[PDB]
Amino acid sequence: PSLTDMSCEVPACTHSSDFGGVAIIKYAASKKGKCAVHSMTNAVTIREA
Amino acid sequence: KERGASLQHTAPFGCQIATNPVRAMNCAVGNMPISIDIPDAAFTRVVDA
C-alpha cells in the first residue's frame, strides 16, 4: 500500500536511554497491508519492525 | 472582667486560635511547596487522545 500524505511529527521526545521519543505519523496509504518502517540513520532506533 | 479582646480577636492575617492544645490555625501566609511523584499509571499516550 503506497503511502502519501507523509505528515510526521512528535508530541514529546526525550533523549533517554530507552524509547523516550514517540512520534506521531499521520499518513494516507492507498490500501490495507503491511508497511516496512525503518530508521535509516544509526542515531535513531525504532523499536518496531 | 477586663481581659477583653482574646487573641482570637487580636490575630493578624486572619489567624485563629484553638485550645486543647492552643494552636494558631488558618493564617495561610507565604507560599507552600509540595513535591508529588506520580507513576505512569495516570498518564496516557497522546494517540489515546
Side-chain angles (χ1 to χ4, degrees):
Chain A
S2 159
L3 284 149
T4 187
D5 201 78
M6 269 69 55
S7 64
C8 193
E9 50 95 12
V10 55
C13 173
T14 286
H15 45 91
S16 88
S17 83
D18 215 6
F19 52 98
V22 51
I24 278 172
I25 311 167
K26 179 55 215 200
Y27 51 83
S30 42
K31 59 177 184 178
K32 319 296 170 188
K34 217 57 177 172
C35 171
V37 305
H38 173 237
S39 175
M40 65 180 281
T41 312
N42 40 1
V44 180
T45 51
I46 173 64
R47 278 83 165 148
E48 278 84 53
Chain B
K1 274 69 50 187
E2 56 97 24
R3 281 163 86 197
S6 174
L7 303 194
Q8 191 41 72
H9 297 244
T10 80
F13 312 99
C15 293
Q16 285 80 22
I17 65 168
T19 176
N20 298 85
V22 73
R23 48 205 188 267
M25 48 166 206
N26 310 318
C27 27
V29 284
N31 298 268
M32 303 300 120
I34 288 94
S35 184
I36 178 65
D37 190 16
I38 184 171
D40 211 352
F43 319 102
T44 178
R45 187 46 177 86
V46 193
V47 313
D48 304 331

